[PDB]
Amino acid sequence: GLFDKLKSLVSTIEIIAPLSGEIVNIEDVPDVVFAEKIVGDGIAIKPTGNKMVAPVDGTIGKIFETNHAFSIESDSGVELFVHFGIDTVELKGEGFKRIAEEGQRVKVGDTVIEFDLPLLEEKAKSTLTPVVISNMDEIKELIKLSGSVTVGETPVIRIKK
Amino acid sequence: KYIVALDQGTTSSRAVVMDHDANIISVSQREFEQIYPKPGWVEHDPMEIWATQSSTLVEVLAKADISSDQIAAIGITNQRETTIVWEKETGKPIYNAIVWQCRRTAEICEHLKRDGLEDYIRSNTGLVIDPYFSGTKVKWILDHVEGSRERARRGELLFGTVDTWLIWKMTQGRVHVTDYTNASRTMLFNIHTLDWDDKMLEVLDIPREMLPEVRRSSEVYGQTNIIPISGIAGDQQAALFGQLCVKEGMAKNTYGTGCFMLMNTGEKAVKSENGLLTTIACGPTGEVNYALEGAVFMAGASIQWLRDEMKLINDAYDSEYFATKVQNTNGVYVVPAFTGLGAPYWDPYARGAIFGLTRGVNANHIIRATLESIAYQTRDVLEAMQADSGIRLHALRVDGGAVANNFLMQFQSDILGTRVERPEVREVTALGAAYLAGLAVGFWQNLDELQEKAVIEREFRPGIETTERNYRYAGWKKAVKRAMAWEEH
Amino acid sequence: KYIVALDQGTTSSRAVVMDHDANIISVSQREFEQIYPKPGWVEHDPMEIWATQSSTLVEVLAKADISSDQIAAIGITNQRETTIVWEKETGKPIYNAIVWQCRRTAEICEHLKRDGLEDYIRSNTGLVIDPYFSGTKVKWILDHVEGSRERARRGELLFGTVDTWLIWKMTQGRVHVTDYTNASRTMLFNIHTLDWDDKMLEVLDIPREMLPEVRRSSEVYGQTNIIPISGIAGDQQAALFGQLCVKEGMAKNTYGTGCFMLMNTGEKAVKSENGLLTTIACGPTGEVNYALEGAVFMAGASIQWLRDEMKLINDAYDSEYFATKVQNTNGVYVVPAFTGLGAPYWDPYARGAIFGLTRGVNANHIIRATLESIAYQTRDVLEAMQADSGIRLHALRVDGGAVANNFLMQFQSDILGTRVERPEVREVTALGAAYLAGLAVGFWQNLDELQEKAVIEREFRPGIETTERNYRYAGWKKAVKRAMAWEEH
Amino acid sequence: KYIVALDQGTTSSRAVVMDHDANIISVSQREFEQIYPKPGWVEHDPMEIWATQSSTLVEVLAKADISSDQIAAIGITNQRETTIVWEKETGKPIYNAIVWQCRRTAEICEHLKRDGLEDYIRSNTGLVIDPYFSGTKVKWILDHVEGSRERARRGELLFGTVDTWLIWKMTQGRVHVTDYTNASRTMLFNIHTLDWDDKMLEVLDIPREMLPEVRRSSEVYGQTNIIPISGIAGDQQAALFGQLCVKEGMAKNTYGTGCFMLMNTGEKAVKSENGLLTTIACGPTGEVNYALEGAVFMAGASIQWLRDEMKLINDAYDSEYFATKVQNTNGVYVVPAFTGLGAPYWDPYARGAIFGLTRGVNANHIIRATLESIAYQTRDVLEAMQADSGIRLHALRVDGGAVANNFLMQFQSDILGTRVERPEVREVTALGAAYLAGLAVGFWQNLDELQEKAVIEREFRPGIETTERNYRYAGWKKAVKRAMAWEEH
Ligand SMILES: Nc1ncnc2c1ncn2[C@@H]1O[C@H](COP(=O)(O)OP(=O)(O)O)[C@@H](O)[C@H]1O
Ligand SMILES: Nc1ncnc2c1ncn2[C@@H]1O[C@H](COP(=O)(O)OP(=O)(O)O)[C@@H](O)[C@H]1O
Ligand SMILES: Nc1ncnc2c1ncn2[C@@H]1O[C@H](COP(=O)(O)OP(=O)(O)O)[C@@H](O)[C@H]1O
């Protein structure tokens, strides 16, 4: 069945996993602006299951119209950017389903985009999903975590402002 | 004291004054007519050009009264390749200025490719067999006047691009001179021998009696009453110099009328295997350096078209606002091949085209798409400058009229994936010609006295839209294919 | 007494009143929104359509007060192929009207060509596997709502093009009817059997419970309180009828939103071997006749685009003036493939494009070139109508909004090389639907009482420019090639 | 659950949905035609008004599906004074809506000033003898139809402003009702007696059989199937209420089509000795409060004119940009007396005018001057609101379409010399009508549950240009003198 009507076992700044999967290095993503931190620094996630979540508590900024990526800004002033796969605007949003709206206030774990990993594995160039801090100028220290993560539960990045 | 700069553009004529620091004290600009006699053709009137360039000169000096004896020297920067031929005696031109843009001589370039004279001209000039360059524009003027060539052996008439045109009029006919950067652009000049190539003179049959004395970029060549005329460089080679791109691997892109990207290579002439040109530029004192180049014909001249012929904007400044009213261009592509496609394509017969139209496409989609093609064109030749060099620019130094469009600079940053450095001095083409003049006239004693004036005012980094980069660019790439070889031949 | 005509266009809704002679006493027209959700897509709102068509009805009758009992009957003409699906019970649509223009269902037409179901559908319907027709637009509405199809077997919701939509709303849901000309346009109807084709219903899986009762073009199908609703034909088939093109070989071209050219063929269904459609039309009493057809999507809707999105004109009437300011279009071609290319091309993926641009090209060249493409498109399908028939038209009978442009009619005459006959009644689509209603209701007793009303007001003959004809048209032909298959799939 | 608001503007028709907090969940708006039969005249079509207001209603509910049984009630706000008269039986209007703007009945107001019936009507209604108000617009409809008045004693036809028009159509003719704020605006209503004035009914000879039942602003007056219709207020009196200006001395200015400034005065009716009106407004539960008012006819309707007739802008949003391209208006004044001059002038015969023109004046000077007159007009009536009251506003609370123009709000701040408070809820006219409905239907239990929703988003303080204030305003003052009494009578 599906489990959202059921209450879940519940719960220096953390950035909780936008997606469930294994961590991969940002420099092991095949797209130079991520691999060399031009647009930001952070990590990628090789996804394992159907939804992307709000990674911190804040406001959604931009969901792109192909619904493969969104930007959000934590009240602790951090702009994170999550982007499923690489060169994904080509799919013209075909496998995504926008769950939220651009000015939307949210909390950690609130769904923003649902996807279809069987179709996307089959069609995207890459499925790895970068999550970077796109306002690196504003931040002091960045510690990246490792291994397995689960959507909305496990931390991936600790920043210190 | 001051140094004066004459900067005679493809569309405007501007004079600008500098003090001993480097400051711009006054800038006068006087725009003039573009003559299109037939569709792929452009022409200016040699007299409308000198009329404007004099007005400006006798306008900066008055604007804040200063004249003849508070001025060290005069530098000359000019638009390249446009050919003029005039009556030595009367100082009257036997035709109009056949502009660099003009496609009129494509048939002569075809005979030159038929002959297998392709590899000779890339080797000895660094250039491509294309209507752009001066060479075959001189053959067309001689082949259309009756008796002009015999009269050219008997010396009654002589050739010149705009730098030698202007200095002749300023020096009552006495001195008739080109510099190295400006001479190289003619296809009649050897870039190795550093003197007029005599096979290139024979195949197009130009009498060597027509040609100028190719002098150097910093050196007093004559006086002017109107006083030492001491500097000359083609406007793209002086913009590289005002940018102090005077050592190898250093580069800049000008978003002027066209987009010209050059990179200093020092003492070596690099063969382009990716559609670029091997030209000549200045080194720290105004000496011959070689450079690598991408020339696109069509940057802000496309915004001139939306304002003057289409009437969609009133100011070119308004392009930023209407372009940022929409968010995307709805699928529309604009290929500004108004005078064929320059680098790296070199297609004389390609014409301008708009693509992907739908009933919901409005005028702001077309305006935004015109601004976008300036950026995509720049990606085409940057991508080529790395394949020819080996270097990978991690920033892009810019200058020009069009760099004041913040949307274009930012869109340029996203489609490229590099930072875009912008100076608070937009006028670096004039400055590059003035430093060039100050040098010869002992006014400055080289570039380190001018290093602390390259403030890089605004910086543009790739925002999160740079992830669309390649998708957006692949639509530009299949759009160009379809504007190619429109004109039948 | 009078007869009322409802003529519901792709862009406008117009009602028009006729006396017993044939005169237009009052005409009200109410334009409405075009919805483009994504680029190749067009949609109207079923309620915005009925809202407008009612306004008009309750406006002609008031305009000169007359109501319900000075009126014999009501005729209905409507734009063809746009599909609506609604809740029988609530009379509320489960989506918007997916217009004929819309390219949304190209993927479904591809599966249908993959299956080798190409020759079956040309044979049994006369049509082409293309997004234009209704069939696969119904599959897309059912495949995107959740539960809509099971609910369609249980009969809660039903299908209709605009004629059955309007009569349902007028007859409080009682009668649900299409005519023969309108049913044929769906790709779900056999043109031989003259009833819904059951293989075509299976491959797209439409429950036959959705469909209307395909009645005939002249016949009282119900009453209206708002009174006998007695006529129905697709607007292009009623324009053929108002033109009295009721015998074989007789033809007309409408320059409306698109250009539709039809030719009566009588009792025979002619197979098009040259990209045309075999449709159904009326014979002298409103009986099934077959016809031959060329549909181009894009005629005056291109002038709507220059006025509304581009903002180059303010009135569509102004297109004549600015177009005759220049003399030629400087080499520019406009291909209005905004919603792909109709006949004879049938390319879903082609998009609009402008070609041959130069810096001297102004807005009047673009306006003149937009008017020219209406003429060149008409030459494309006329050239095809002769190859399919054998007939050679020595004149061309026209009607529409755009026939009031004298430059277009004259340019049409020169590019074709035939005369162009123009009526003083521009409104013949409404009239064709009204004669159709008068017939059934005993108001007229057939067409000879209406022959003496086809005055052919202005005639256009080939002037001396018809010698450019082929040169001009070969530039149009290489322009279309390049707008073809733009959209990637 | 939700509450629905119908807000039927002079130019648009908008429906908006609210949840139990106060949020706007959906807003649909449907603009319609303005009919000008002769120059100083404006008219809307009663049916085009109901057509639009229904569309919107059956659009917000669908936009996010919700219907009939997730909705507590319906509130009605409407443009004031425009008179409709219809056939009770057929529900068909015997004329068009003679709008508040329209100057047609100036001759009747002259007979009323001739009679010395000036002081009676200011005293018993609070109003001015001017074409604006409803009273004499009803006399003109009756005096131009043949037999309409005798038929009005026999009750076949009845009067109503837009609130009673809309509720009648919604309640199939059953209830025919006005509220207090809307009834007061007719000049046929005593503001003391709080019932129709019978001398005012005699001098214009309206049968009392025509009039509505003047009910109250919060109260269920009927049901709607389309469900309790529970609120009604004139759009300027509901905007005062959404602004929670529900106690004395509290005030707001709406920059809508016209500019309306009102101030609550509680239980007292204050006589204006400075050209203002004494009207009726709501108190904290929807009870009769009196208010003080300045009505100017012409605010964003002037930006509609530059966009639609003059074609100088394309969007009204574009007015901010072109207006801030120039810095000043070069001496140009615009007096928007398109339908005479409202408060404090009350001149029927004044017409619009542009002043101080020079050859260097361009279109951005005219656009900036149109935006400036909105600000100067507001200074005219604010200056009057202080002389009538005694209060001195130290801030100005605003709302409307035009408050999103930051230049206008800032210029308003400088020309006034006070702060300008702007809400993040621009839609407070709808909200004021909804609170009014929620109240009666027990959905809210008064205003303190809505106090914490008046965030005052942006604040505008006088910058250093407020020192030009009076110089700029004295040029406006001599400009108005010259647009006064243009129309001859
Ligand atoms: N804001 C702008 N956006 C885009 N193009 C601009 C803008 N401002 C100026 N331009 C264009 O830049 C060109 C002027 O650039 P400039 O370098 O000074 O002259 P040139 O090309 O003759 O050397 C013109 O073609 C003008 O249309
Ligand atoms: N003078 C004109 N020149 C060109 N196109 C015109 C002109 N007048 C009207 N049109 C176009 O004709 C179309 C209206 O034609 P019409 O046959 O009445 O409607 P429809 O196509 O909806 O049946 C519009 O698309 C309009 O832009
Ligand atoms: N940015 C703007 N600047 C100036 N006027 C504007 C602007 N935006 C909208 N308007 C004008 O505001 C008016 C709409 O205001 P609104 O209060 O919603 O309607 P109404 O006057 O019918 O109640 C229109 O007349 C429109 O031209």
Out of D234, D256, D284, pick the residue that ends a domain. Answer: D234
Residue C154 tokens, joined:
């249980």
Compute the distance between CA of residue C217 and CA of residue C233 in angstroms, rounded to an integer.
Answer: 6
Q: How far is the CA of D162 from the centre of ligand 2 (A)?
A: 36
Q: Are residues C456 and C412 in the same domain?
A: yes
Pick the closest to residue C309 from C370, C360, C266, C261 (CA basis): C370
Q: Is C160 within a domain?
A: yes
Residues contacting ligand 1 via CB (< 6 Å): B 9-12, 256-257, 300-301, 303-304, 316-317, 319-320, 400-402, 404-405
**Cα–Cα separations (whole angstroms), residue B112 to B105, B139, B272:** 11, 12, 20
Of B33, B257, B334, B367, the residue with max ligand 1 atoms within 8 A of its CB, to mutate for a pocket test, comes to B257
CB atoms under 10 Å from CB of D114, counted, come to: 9
- In the chain, the amino acid numbered D229 is I
Q: Are residues B50 and B135 in the same domain?
A: yes
Report the topology of domain A1-161.
Glucose Permease (Domain IIA) (2.70.70)
CB atoms under 10 Å from CB of C134, counted, come to: 28
Q: How far is the CA of C357 from the centre of ligand 1 (A)?
A: 20
CB B287 within 8 A of CB B446: no
Q: Are residues C224 and C313 in the same domain?
A: no
Pick the closest to residue D472 from D273, D328, D336, D296 (CA basis): D328
Helix residue ranges, H only, C18-105 = 46-63
3-class secondary-structure state, position C150? helix
Ligand 3 atom nearest to CA at D255: 17
Q: Are residues D293 and D430 in the same domain?
A: yes
Q: Is B489 within a domain?
A: no
Residue B151 tokens, joined:
């009269």
Compute the distance between CA of residue C242 and CA of residue C236 in angstroms, rounded to an integer.
Answer: 10
Q: Are residues D145 and D267 in the same domain?
A: no
- Tokens 């975590």: give the residue: A145
**Cα–Cα separations (whole angstroms), residue B98 to B6, B43, B134, B162, C50:** 21, 5, 9, 11, 62
Q: Are residues C268 and C244 in the same domain?
A: yes
Compute the distance between CA of residue D190 and CA of residue D302 in angstroms, rounded to an integer.
Answer: 34
Mention every residue, 6+ apart, whose C-beta is less than 8 A from residue B347: B337, B340, B341, B484, B485
Domain boundaries, chain A: 1-161
Q: Is B307 within a domain?
A: yes
* Catalytic residue annotation of A: 83
Q: Is B90 within a domain?
A: yes
Range of the domain at C64: 1-234
Resolution (A): 2.6
**Residue D311 is nearest to which of C47, C51, C314, comparing CB atoms?**
C314
- In the chain, the amino acid numbered B171 is T
Q: Is C298 within a domain?
A: yes
Residue D2 tokens, joined:
């939700």
Q: Is C376 within a domain?
A: yes
Helix residue ranges, H only, C281-362 = 301-308, 318-323
Q: Are residues B263 and B144 in the same domain?
A: no
CB neighbour burial string for C415-442, b if at least 16 within 10 angstroms, e if fewer: bbebbbbbbebbbbbbbbbbbbbbbbbe
3-class secondary-structure state, position A124? coil
Residue C244 tokens, joined:
């009295």
3-class secondary-structure state, position B469? helix
CB B416 within 8 A of CB B395: no
Q: Are residues B28 and B135 in the same domain?
A: yes
Rg (CA), chain B: 21
Pick the closest to residue D145 from D86, D81, D82, D80 (CA basis): D86
Containing H/E element for C436?
helix C428-440
Out of B234, B253, B281, pick the residue that ends a domain. Answer: B234
Asked if B353 has any chain C CB less than 8 Å from its own CB, the reply is: yes
Q: Are residues D157 and D48 in the same domain?
A: yes
**CATH number of the domain enclosing C419:** 3.30.420.40
CB D432 within 8 A of CB D241: yes
Q: Which chains lie within 8 Å of chain C at 3 or more CB pairs, if any?
A: B, D
Asked if A92 has any chain B CB less than 8 Å from its own CB, the reply is: no
Quote the distance between the C-alpha of residue C124 and its chain's center.
21
Asked if D25 has any chain C CB less than 8 Å from its own CB, the reply is: no
Compute the distance between CA of residue D164 and CA of residue D214 in angstroms, rounded to an integer.
Answer: 10
Please, what is the end-to-end C-alpha distance for chain C in angstroms?
A: 56
Q: Is C489 within a domain?
A: no
Compute the distance between CA of residue C85 and CA of residue C43 in angstroms, rounded to an integer.
Answer: 13
Compute the distance between CA of residue D368 and CA of residue C119 in angstroms, rounded to an integer.
Answer: 65
Compute the distance between CA of residue C234 and CA of residue C163 in angstroms, rounded to an integer.
Answer: 8
Quote the distance between the C-alpha of residue A98 and its chain's center.
14
Technique used to solve these coordinates: X-ray
Residues contacting ligand 2 via CB (< 6 Å): C 9-12, 256-257, 300-301, 303-304, 316-317, 319-320, 400-402, 404-405
CB B318 within 8 A of CB B332: no
Mention every residue, 6+ apart, whose C-beta is less than 8 A from residue D199: D120, D124
Q: Count the domains in chain D.
A: 2
Q: Are residues C246 and C356 in the same domain?
A: yes
Strand partners, A13: A159
Compute the distance between CA of residue B73 and CA of residue B439 in angstroms, rounded to an integer.
Answer: 10
Of C56, C259, C303, C317, the residue with max ligand 2 atoms within 8 A of its CB, to mutate for a pocket test, comes to C303
Helix residue ranges, H only, D98-194 = 106-114, 118-125, 135-144, 148-153, 162-170, 180-184
CB C340 within 8 A of CB C297: yes
CB D253 within 8 A of CB D377: no
**Cα–Cα separations (whole angstroms), residue B329 to B349, B354, B368, B369, C249:** 27, 12, 6, 6, 46
**B contacts of A39 (beta carbons < 8 Å):** 462-464, 466-467
Strand partners, D264: D291
Residue count of chain C: 489
Residues contacting ligand 3 via CB (< 6 Å): D 9-12, 256-257, 300-301, 303-304, 316-317, 319-320, 400-402, 404-405
CB neighbour burial string for D319-340, b if at least 16 within 10 angstroms, e if fewer: bbbbbbbbeebbebbbbbbbbb
Reported in sequence order, the residue ranges of C133-270 that DSSP labels E, i.e. its strands, are 157-161, 177-178, 189-190, 195-196, 213-214, 218-223, 228-234, 251-255, 259-266
Q: Is D257 within a domain?
A: yes
Q: Are residues D229 and D349 in the same domain?
A: no
Compute the distance between CA of residue B61 and CA of residue B68 in angstroms, rounded to an integer.
Answer: 9
CB D450 within 8 A of CB D435: yes
Compute the distance between CA of residue A143 and CA of residue A149 in angstroms, rounded to an integer.
Answer: 16
Out of C234, C250, C265, pick the residue that ends a domain. Answer: C234
Instruction: Indicate which residue's Cα is closest to atom 11 of ligand 3.
Output: D300
Q: Are residues C310 and C190 in the same domain?
A: no
